[PDB]
Amino acid sequence: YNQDKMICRKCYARLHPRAVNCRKKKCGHSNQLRPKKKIKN
Amino acid sequence: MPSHKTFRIKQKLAKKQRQNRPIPYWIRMRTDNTIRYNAKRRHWRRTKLGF
Amino acid sequence: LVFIVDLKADKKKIKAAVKKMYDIQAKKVNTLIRPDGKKKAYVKLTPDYDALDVANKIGII
Amino acid sequence: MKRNPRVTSSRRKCRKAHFTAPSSVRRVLMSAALSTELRHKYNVRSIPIRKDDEVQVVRGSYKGREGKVVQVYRRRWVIHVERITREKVNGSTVNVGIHPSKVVVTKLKLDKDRKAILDRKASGRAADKA
Amino acid sequence: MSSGKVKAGELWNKSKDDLTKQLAELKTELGQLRIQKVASSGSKLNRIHDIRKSIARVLTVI
Amino acid sequence: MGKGTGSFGKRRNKTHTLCVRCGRRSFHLQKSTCSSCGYPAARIRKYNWSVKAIRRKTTGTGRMRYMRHVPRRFKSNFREGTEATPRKRAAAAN
RNA sequence: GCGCGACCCCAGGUCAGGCGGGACUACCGCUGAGUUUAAGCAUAUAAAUAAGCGGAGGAGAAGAAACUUACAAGGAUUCCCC
RNA sequence: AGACCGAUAGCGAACAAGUACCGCGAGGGAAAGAUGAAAAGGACUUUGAAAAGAGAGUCAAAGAGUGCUUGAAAUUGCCGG
RNA sequence: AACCCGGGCGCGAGCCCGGGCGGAGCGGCCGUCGGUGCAGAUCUUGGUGGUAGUAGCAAAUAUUCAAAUGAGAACUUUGAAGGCCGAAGAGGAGAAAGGUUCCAUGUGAACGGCACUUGCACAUGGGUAAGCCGAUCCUAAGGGAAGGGGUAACCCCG
RNA sequence: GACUCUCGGCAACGGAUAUCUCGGCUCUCGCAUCGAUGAAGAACGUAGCGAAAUGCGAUACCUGGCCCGUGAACCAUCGAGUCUUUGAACGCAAGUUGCGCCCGAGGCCACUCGGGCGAGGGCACGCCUGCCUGGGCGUCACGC
């Protein structure tokens, strides 16, 4: 799948394409996600 | 991902890992003959795993 | 309850096997190959018959 | 080398076969020479021993001692006799294994089936003698 | 009986019906020697060897 | 840039894995061939110009073989005779 | 100017019964090299080897004469000796 | 079975040997035996960073004390001329 | 017997004895066998000396003061002080690959190119839990299974 | 009055020498198959403590056929059984695993119509022999 996972800029914690938000510790709709740009070199 | 998954390599790797254990204090004692340096016992740093 | 099982297990046969031999309904079963070579199975049971007094007659820690 | 149509002579194989010995060959290693009274009742020069027998030490430092056989080991054919012990450095007392060749059987536990063999060997040895 | 068993000749002189109850009883008891492995007793040694044979004898004989 | 020192690190990727037929790391996975037994290949790889060590291995050596030999030594396939039961009995005569 | 049931050739299926495909160390049957030798080399030699391939048995394989022949006789066939 | 070899020899392999190990792989591939008649296989005590050491005990023998028969050479220390 | 040391004979190859050690096998004459004699071969294998207590353990300047614990502390652990890392000359999550290296407890012969109480060394135990993550199902260079036919055949096109 | 040369003593190191030999080498006799009724090759289990080894097989050093009468095994065991899984490997796939479909007696509930459990079996390697199935080829019977 071309979506890969979304990895949070604060915590750096990976949480889905279906989850709206991160939550690794209270990250808690911080919405500070960017997806895996979908594969390189 | 899994952490390369397939059961069929994964089990046999785990068997060699169980097989690489110390000899059991006893077999040194009843015993026939040997400085029982077991010997097919393999290491995380050195030489290299085979199948 | 936590059993070690055979390597040509599943979850349906164990959900049956446990049911026969210990008289309890089991709700889910979770299955692992182990570095043992053996299959480690966690068996979650009905609250109608609790793992504690299921266990006591074949005590386990 | 010398003679008979059979399996075996044979300095490589025989030294190997009897030192590590297979079973009836292990039963043969358990033979101790009879005492003279038994030697003329049961008509034989030697017999396999046993455990409710009684045995006199001829060879060793223990020589002259007599006692009941406690146990015998098949694997390394040796037997332990009661009171034939040496004391270990701690002082615990350990049996000293003895080869049967060293010992002579004074008394046997007769049995009935093993007795029947005794009854068989006596019949055999009458045909060499008379 | 209440004590463990068996001889080869005893199984042979039992019916198909008897020997399977005997096979039944044996797995159950074996199953006990598994929890009794946590105990680690020497009685569970001797017995876990000899029960293994009794199962093999019932399985062959049938 | 070049050879071995950098090229040993590049590497990560796999060709030779275990064969199912012989049990030896030699199966060339994306070229679907074993260079130790042939697999796929109908009959087992034997070459008789790979002489001494290799030939003996390919014969094999881990056999049961005793189990065949004992029949071969018997010849038959029958056994009756059940002697030694209280009377007793009929292995002695009279 | 014609359809139908039946005989007879081919084909597919089907379950049955029966055999075969891989193996054992060499022995045991086609294809088929070179180093080398000929102080070079090309016929020749190494060598119908090795090797590759296929397949058998406890042994194979070969066999009761359109044979030998150089006479005048022998009398299936291997092998040993020469 | 032997005018064979006898542990650098004989098989690569007397033992844990096609083992340990090398190579992506085809394939390659060692070194590896011996206390003692009997384990009697070193109690008890002192010491010590640890091992070990001291003293003593067993045996015909411990420079027979554990890859322990014998114990060359090449070499080291101490020491003697 | 072997070994070590010397004594005697023989030009001599070599023979012999005495002492110690060793602790079971060893000769001589004749007649034969032959894996039958080394200093060497960039000889092989093993061992061993000098080289030497020598080279290396040197460029991010990185620790310092107190203290814990310990038979033992420059390097284990606490605090303070001081820095260094910044698309990662040392942050987070992962693919392959490794293959149990993870956690805990107990050690310390070997390792760590040093110390070590420590450790990714040693030993023993323990941990990985999926209806909703991934495998899995699909199909892409192609590996192709399926005539016929070359090819003994392996094997190869379709 | 150093440190150093040569030889020796005492010891170590080292493992030659000598003997030993649970081994080969070689020669020779004997004997001689194992297979799709799963051999042979390998996997991983299998123990009280199990890493070796050989031995076995999801039944797991197997095993079938405590001392005065049925325990034990290269006693011989010219004796026979399990023989998981891969492996010719044969239902299909495959890095010694997995897979989805069909058929199923007999238990059950509805207890009328139906369902739903369950062992076990099956899912082109090739060829022959017996059975089905369809045209094609020359035709008889038959009405036109």
Distance CA D28, CA D100 (A): 10
Instruction: Assess contact for F19 and F39: CB atoms under 8 A.
Output: yes
Instruction: Assess contact for B36 and B27: CB atoms under 8 A.
Output: yes
Instruction: Assess contact for D83 and D67: CB atoms under 8 A.
Output: yes
Q: Residue D88, CB, less than 7 Å from strand H?
A: yes
Instruction: Give the nearest chain B residue to F24 (CA atoms).
Output: B51
> Solving technique for this entry?
cryo-EM
Give D79's strand partners: D72, D98
Experimental resolution (Å): 34.0
Q: Which residue has the tokens 């895996």?
A: A36
Residue B40: phi and psi, rounded to 5, are -75, 25
Distance CA F17, CA B4 (A): 14
Chains that touch A (3 or more CB pairs under 8 A): none
Point out the residue nearest to J30 (C-alpha to C1').
D7
Residue B34: phi and psi, rounded to 5, are 150, 120
Interface of C with B in 42-61 (CB under 8 A): none
Q: Does E38 touch chain C (CB under 8 A)?
A: yes
SS3 D78: strand
Chains that touch D (3 or more CB pairs under 8 A): none
H/E element, D129 = helix D113-129
Residues of chain F whose C-beta is under 8 A from some C-beta in B?
17-18, 23-25
Per-residue CA distances from B44 to B16, F11, F13 (Å): 13, 20, 20
Q: Residue F77, CB, less than 7 Å from strand J?
A: yes
Q: Residue D8, CB, less than 7 Å from strand J?
A: no
Distance CA B49, CA F25 (A): 10
Q: For residue C53, give the nearest of C17, C32, C23, C20 by alpha carbon.
A: C23
Distance CA B42, CA B16 (A): 9
Distance CA E26, CA D116 (A): 39
Instruction: Assess contact for D42 and D122: CB atoms under 8 A.
Output: yes
Question: Both tokens of residue E3?
Answer: 């004590």
Q: For residue D96, give the nearest of D78, D113, D111, D112 by alpha carbon.
A: D78
Q: At what angle do helices E16-39 and E42-61 cross, to 10 degrees?
A: 160
Distance CA E41, CA E46 (A): 10
Distance, Å, F55 CA → G43 C1'? 40
Helices of type H across C1-47: 12-22
Instruction: Assess contact for D86 and D96: CB atoms under 8 A.
Output: yes
Distance CA B21, CA B5 (A): 24
Distance, Å, E16 CA → H51 C1'? 68
Peptide bond into D122 cis (omega under 30): no
Distance CA D70, CA D50 (A): 9
Q: Which residue has the tokens 């790889």?
A: F45
Q: Other CB atoms closer than 10 Å to residue D26's CB: what's the count?
A: 16
The one-letter amino acid at F37: C
Residue C14: phi and psi, rounded to 5, are -65, -45
- The end-to-end CA distance of chain C, in Å, is 10
Q: Does B14 touch chain F (CB under 8 A)?
A: no
SS3 D47: strand
CB contact under 8 A, B11 and C37: yes
Q: Residue F33, CB, less than 7 Å from strand H?
A: no
Question: Both tokens of residue F6?
Answer: 């950098």
Q: For residue C31, give the nearest of C41, C44, C18 by alpha carbon.
A: C41
Distance, Å, D83 CA → I62 C1'? 75
Residue D114: phi and psi, rounded to 5, are -60, -35
The one-letter amino acid at D52: D
Instruction: Assess contact for D85 and D94: CB atoms under 8 A.
Output: yes
Question: Both tokens of residue E37?
Answer: 């492995």
The one-letter amino acid at D64: G
Residue C23, min C-alpha distance to chain B (Å): 32
Q: Residue E56: CB partners within 8 Å, gap ≥ 6?
A: none
The 8-class DSSP code of residue C57 comes to G
Pairing of strands F16-18, F25-28: antiparallel
Number of helices followed by number of strands (H, E) in chain D:
4, 8
Q: What is the 3-state secondary structure (H, E, C) of F10-51?
A: HCCCCCEEECCCCCCEEEEHHHCEECCCCCCCCCCCCCCCCC
Give residue C25's region: left, alpha or beta (phi > 0; psi -120 to 50). Answer: beta
Is the pair E, C in contact (3+ CB pairs within 8 Å)? yes
Q: Residue F64, CB, less than 7 Å from strand G?
A: no
Distance CA D102, CA D99 (A): 6
Q: Other CB atoms closer than 10 Å to residue E58's CB: what's the count?
A: 18
Distance CA A41, CA F8 (A): 19
